[PDB]
Amino acid sequence: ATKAVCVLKGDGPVQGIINFEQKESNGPVKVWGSIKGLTEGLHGFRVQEFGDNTAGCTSAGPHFNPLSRKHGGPKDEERHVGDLGNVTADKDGVADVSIEDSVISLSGDHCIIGRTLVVHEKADDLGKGGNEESTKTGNAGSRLACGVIGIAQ
Amino acid sequence: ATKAVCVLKGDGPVQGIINFEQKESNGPVKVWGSIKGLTEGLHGFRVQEFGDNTAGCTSAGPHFNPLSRKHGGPKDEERHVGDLGNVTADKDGVADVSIEDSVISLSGDHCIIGRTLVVHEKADDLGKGGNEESTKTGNAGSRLACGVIGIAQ
Numbered sequence: 001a002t003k004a005v006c007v008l009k010g011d012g013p014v015q016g017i018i019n020f021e022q023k024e025s026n027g028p029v030k031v032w033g034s035i036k037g038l039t040e041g042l043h044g045f046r047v048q049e050f051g052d053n054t055a056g057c058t059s060a061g062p063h064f065n066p067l068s069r070k071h072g073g074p075k076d077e078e079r080h081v082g083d084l085g086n087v088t089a090d091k092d093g094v095a096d097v098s099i100e101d102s103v104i105s106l107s108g109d110h111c112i113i114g115r116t117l118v119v120h121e122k123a124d125d126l127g128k129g130g131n132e133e134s135t136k137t138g139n140a141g142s143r144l145a146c147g148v149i150g151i152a153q
Numbered sequence: 154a155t156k157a158v159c160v161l162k163g164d165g166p167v168q169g170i171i172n173f174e175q176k177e178s179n180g181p182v183k184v185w186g187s188i189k190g191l192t193e194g195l196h197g198f199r200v201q202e203f204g205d206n207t208a209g210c211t212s213a214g215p216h217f218n219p220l221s222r223k224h225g226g227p228k229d230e231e232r233h234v235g236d237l238g239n240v241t242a243d244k245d246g247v248a249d250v251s252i253e254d255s256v257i258s259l260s261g262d263h264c265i266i267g268r269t270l271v272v273h274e275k276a277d278d279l280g281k282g283g284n285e286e287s288t289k290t291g292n293a294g295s296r297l298a299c300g301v302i303g304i305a306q
């Protein structure tokens with residue numbers, strides 16, 4: 001049993017705290033928390049490969065993708081390990097996050113600890129946008145906030 | 154993994170980027186980079202157990218200590234895995250960091266990925282202060298800057 005936590009911060013208003021919990025080494029991972037300072041609507045939400053924020057969110061690189069797959073939604077059979085779809089911000093700019101995912105992990109080779117959680121300007125088109133960027137990143141526009149995923153007590 | 158990076162930030166002017174390399178899984182870890190905005194002199198430098206920065210540098214818990222040892226210097230056999238001694242800041246408040254350590258690791262039981270690197274207000278006394286706190290924390294005062302250690306390769 002493992003827990004992780006991530007504090008998302010950026011250059012603007014977007015700020016949040018995301019908790020991860022995994023009860024068993026191969027089990028589903030529970031992702032929950034809150035992000036605020038968002039424009040109402042859907043925002044791309046994923047894990048980038050590196051826990052590298054030296055030049056801001058760019059340094060974190062491509063979506064975490066150890067199986068060398070194409071970008072997709074979290075319930076698609078072709079996706080990056082890091083692909084967690086969209087979070088939804090309400091009228092107050094608050095995205096209450098409550099995800100379960102069975103592909104990310106807090107141990108083993110899908111371990112996302114030490115990697116970067118990021119929230120984006122626009123919606124993830126889930127790899128269904130009909131262009132090359134869709135199949136790479138989901139066309140979610142610029143990165144608004146990110147942080148390194150750490151071990152939690 | 155093989156390469157790590159940590160961005161240190163605080164509420165004051167202390168900031169820096171710390172790199173880690175370990176090409177052999179049991180082997181030494183090279184630690185290098187620079188921390189600026191420090192008072193001239195020795196500053197405690199350690200890995201805390203949790204990569205939890207939800208309440209700033211406070212929420213990262215105790216020195217990383219999976220072997221249940223007392224606080225020591227990095228050269229000591231009795232030390233916390235996280236005990237990395239002191240960095241030295243010059244007249245301009247810049248601390249060039251150059252360290253080789255074979256107790257921390259970028260994988261396994263002593264993996265520091267997902268944990269907190271911190272730099273302190275004053276010197277770590279390396280467990281030689283004579284009081285009770287010395288063998289607990291090394292009396293390095295308050296936490297000036299921290300960050301979560303992330304995967305870089």
Ligand SMILES: [Zn+2]
Pocket residue numbers: 046063070071072079080082083136137138
């Ligand atoms: Zn993706």
Ligand SMILES: [Zn+2]
Pocket residue numbers: 077
């Ligand atoms: Zn199919």
Ligand SMILES: [Zn+2]
Pocket residue numbers: 199216223224225233235236289290
């Ligand atoms: Zn210690």
Ligand SMILES: [Zn+2]
Pocket residue numbers: 230
């Ligand atoms: Zn000896």
